[PDB]
C-alpha cells in the first residue's frame, strides 16, 4: 500500500530530529544520522533528499533535518562526519565498564536512561588486542583529545618542559597515550584517562 | 429524561462533596488558633521571640 511503501521508506527509516545544526551546547552524543551516498550519486548530484544537493557539496556524507522548507531549500549541513570519531574509538580499542551488566551484558519497559555504550562499543570488555593497549596518540588539551575523545593526561612525574616544548600548541602537538580507560556517564558522556609518555 | 436527571444529579453531587471535603480540609484544621485575643498573643509571641524568615536565601 502507498503507506506500506512509505512505512519501509529509507526516508522514514531515518527518524525526525529538529536539533539545531550548530548545537553550540557541549556535545557528547551525536545529534543526527549522516546520509551516506555512493560516489556515483554524488556525480549524478543525487542524495535521496526532497531537493538535489548542490554540486558545491563534494562530500559523500551529509546530515539533513528538513527534506525541504518554506525557504524552498533543504536544511542540511554537509559536515556530517561522526563516521570518523566512532571509528577512532575502534582505532583506540578500549572497553567501557558500563556499570554492572546484570544478565544481559548491557542489562538496562523502556531503557531510556542508562541506554548503554550507546553504540560506541559492541565488543567483549576483556581481550588481548590488552597488551598495555596501543598507546594511542592524543591531542593534550592542557585532558587530551584522543581519537576525538578527550582523556585526562596522567604521568609518573609532571613534565613542564614537555608542555613548554609545544608552548601554546599543546593541542596542536599529539602525544601517544596508553589510555587508562573510559566510561559512559548516564548522560551518554565518555570520561577517559591518558598516559603522557613524557 | 432519566439520564438527563442523573447527569444533573451527579454534577451537583460532585460539587457539594468537594465543597464538604475542602471545608473539613482546612476549616477542620486551619492553625486551630487565630480568632481569639489569647491565641494571637501566643502566635505573635512565638514569632520574633525565636525564629525570623527572610529571603537572602541560604
Amino acid at each position: 500500500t502507498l503507506a506500506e511503501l512509505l512505512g519501509r521508506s529509507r526516508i522514514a527509516q531515518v527518524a525526525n530530529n529538529h536539533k539545531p545544526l550548530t548545537y553550540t551546547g557541549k556535545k557528547f552524543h551525536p545529534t543526527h544520522q549522516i546520509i551516506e551516498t555512493k560516489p556515483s550519486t554524488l556525480y549524478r548530484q543525487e542524495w535521496g533528499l526532497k531537493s538535489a544537493i548542490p554540486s558545491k557539496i563534494k562530500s559523500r556524507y551529509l546530515v539533513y533535518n528538513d527534506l525541504d522548507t518554506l525557504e524552498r531549500i533543504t536544511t542540511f549541513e554537509p559536515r556530517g562526519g561522526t563516521q570518523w570519531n566512532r571509528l577512532r574509538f575502534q582505532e583506540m580499542g578500549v572497553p567501557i565498564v558500563s556499570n554492572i551488566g546484570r544478565q544481559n551484558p548491557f542489562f538496562k519497559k523502556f531503557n531510556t536512561e542508562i541506554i548503554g555504550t550507546g553504540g560506541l562499543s559492541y565488543s567483549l570488555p576483556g581481550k588481548l588486542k590488552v597488551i598495555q593497549r596501543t598507546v594511542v596518540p592524543g591531542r593534550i588539551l592542557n585532558l587530551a583529545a584522543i581519537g576525538g575523545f578527550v582523556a585526562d593526561v596522567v604521568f609518573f612525574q609532571s613534565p613542564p618542559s614537555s608542555f613548554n616544548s609545544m608552548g601554546d600548541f599543546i593541542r596542536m602537538k599529539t602525544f601517544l597515550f596508553e589510555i587508562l580507560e573510559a566510561s559512559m556517564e548516564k548522560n551518554g558522556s565518555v570520561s577517559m584517562h591518558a598516559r603522557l609518555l613524557e | 429524561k432519566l439520564k438527563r436527571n442523573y447527569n444533573r444529579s451527579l454534577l451537583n453531587f460532585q460539587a457539594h462533596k468537594k465543597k464538604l471535603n475542602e471545608l473539613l480540609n482546612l476549616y477542620h484544621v486551619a492553625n486551630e488558633f487565630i480568632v481569639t485575643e489569647s491565641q494571637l498573643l501566643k502566635k505573635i509571641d512565638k514569632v520574633f521571640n525565636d525564629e525570623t524568615e527572610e529571603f537572602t536565601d541560604a
Binding site: 561522526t82 591531542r139 575523545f149 593541542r171 | -
Partner: protein
C-alpha cells in the same frame, strides 16, 4: 602564551573535530551564543522583592520581550509583581 579569543577549550567530555579545532569555529560559536520561566504564578511573588530583582535592567526598568523572553502572561505577571512589589514596601 596566548589570548583567549583564539583558543577553544572544549571540555574533555565533548567530541573535538579537525575543524572544531579552528578559528572559524571560534567565530562560529560566538555568533550562536529561571524558576519564573518554569511556570510559577510570577504575581504570587508580589512581595519577595528578591525574586523580582532578577529580570530588571538594574535601573528600576523591566525588559522588552527580546531579553526576558518570558511567556507573555509570565512576563506581564512578573511586571505586575514588580509594580505591586513597589507598592509592597520592599522594592
Amino acid at each position: 602564551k596566548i589570548d583567549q579569543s583564539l583558543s577553544k577549550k572544549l571540555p574533555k567530555g565533548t567530541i573535538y573535530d579537525p575543524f572544531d579545532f579552528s578559528m572559524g569555529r571560534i567565530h562560529l560559536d560566538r555568533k550562536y551564543q529561571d524558576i519564573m520561566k518554569s511556570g510559577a504564578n510570577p504575581l504570587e511573588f508580589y512581595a519577595r522583592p528578591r525574586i523580582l530583582s532578577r529580570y530588571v535592567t538594574s535601573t528600576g526598568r523591566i525588559q522588552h520581550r527580546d531579553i526576558t523572553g518570558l511567556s507573555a502572561k509570565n512576563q506581564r505577571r512578573l511586571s505586575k509583581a514588580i509594580r505591586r512589589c513597589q507598592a509592597i514596601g520592599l522594592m
